[PDB]
Amino acid sequence: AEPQIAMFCGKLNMHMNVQNGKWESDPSGTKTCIDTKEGILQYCQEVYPELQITNVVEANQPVTIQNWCKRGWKQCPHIVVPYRCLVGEFVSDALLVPDKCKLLHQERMDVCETHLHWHTVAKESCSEKSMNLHDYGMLLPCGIDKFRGVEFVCCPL
Amino acid sequence: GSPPGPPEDVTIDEITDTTAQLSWRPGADNHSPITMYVVQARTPFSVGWQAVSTVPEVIDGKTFTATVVGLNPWVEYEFRVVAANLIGIGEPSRPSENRRTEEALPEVTPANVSGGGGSKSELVITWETVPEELQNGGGFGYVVAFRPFGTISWMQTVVASPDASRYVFRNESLPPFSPYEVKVGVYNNKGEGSFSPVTVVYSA
């Protein structure tokens, strides 16, 4: 469905086949987990050669992937947080706002922060309102997997 | 006798989001008593100089300060003062210093919210950008909301650029040429504005 890569150190990297919706192993059969966000961007671009990959961001929920392989597609379950391979000009995510829930957002031109930082901001913001955080997404990229803001949905308990 | 000379030393004493306190001093009346002062304003968006409303509504020739009202928030203003006597309206003063009104909540929602077309399984939403003089503050942006026609929950996204006029929702499971309720709202650094009226837009 959506372009994304998933890693578990010791195994070959996985990526989402957008045509059939299945997770597939590294095409070269050699690439394992990557240490920098810049390297993840390069791997996204390698495994999606037809797509204009411009950034990466952690997915918001983990996925259970079976059939992880070792080097050479040998010895082919792990619950991992994948990285979304973002395409072209940055497009903010559309968030579900159910009845009685509220869309909140925060943009700070002097702050360049991580996905984890903005998740914490959104979670604490909903909690301080006696509400629960549901969907959230990043705003305003300032680097590779770095952002200046967050959009998020708070819902009643 | 002749119309009055230019008033002098026009100053913006204080400025808010919609008002400004102005002060000035009299120029020559040219042998006919000054009976009225009028205030004009100029912005980057006006067609030259334009009259503005004041408190008091009519400034007599014995008054040298007044409050200008009905100003546009977050807009660069200059003001000038013109005297009049029985012979006629006089020459305008030199303009005041340039000062921007304070920020305020945005009040205008985007015009001509619409959409349609696009590539396979795309929902295209468009609107007319809100011009700078109606954004009412820095940090202006849009909130785009859409839902399948007849449902309750809204899909919403923050479009943080004030120059944006278009949002495309790409999803492979989105059905073809299906009706969506769509509305577009506004916000700025002072806080949230309102949503436009709802309109119906079809996917590709």
Residue numbers in the entry:
A (entry chain A): 30 to 105, 109 to 189
B (entry chain B): 595 to 798
Reproduce, without paraphrasing, sentences from the article in which this PDB structure was first reported:
Contactins (CNTNs) are neural cell adhesion molecules that encode axon-target specificity during the patterning of the vertebrate visual and olfactory systems. Because CNTNs are tethered to the plasma membrane by a glycosylphosphatidylinositol anchor, they lack an intracellular region to communicate across the membrane. Instead, they form coreceptor complexes with distinct transmembrane proteins to transmit signals inside the cell.
We first sought to gain structural insights into CNTN–amyloid interactions by focusing on the CNTN4–APP complex. Although both the chicken and mouse complexes crystallized, only the former yielded crystals that diffracted well enough to allow structure determination. The FN1–FN3 region of chicken CNTN4 is characterized by a sharp bend between the FN2 and FN3 domains that appears to be a hallmark of vertebrate CNTNs. The binding site involves the second FN repeat of CNTN4 and the copper-binding domain of APP, though it does not overlap with residues involved in copper binding. The complex interface occludes only ∼600 Å2 of surface area, but with a high shape complementarity coefficient of 0.78, which is consistent with values calculated for trypsin–trypsin-inhibitor structures. In addition, the side-chain oxygen atom of S124 in APP forms a hydrogen bond with T751 in CNTN4, whereas its main chain oxygen atom forms a hydrogen bond with the side chain of Y761. In the chicken CNTN4–APP complex, A126 forms van der Waals interactions with the side-chain atoms of M749, Y761, and F763.
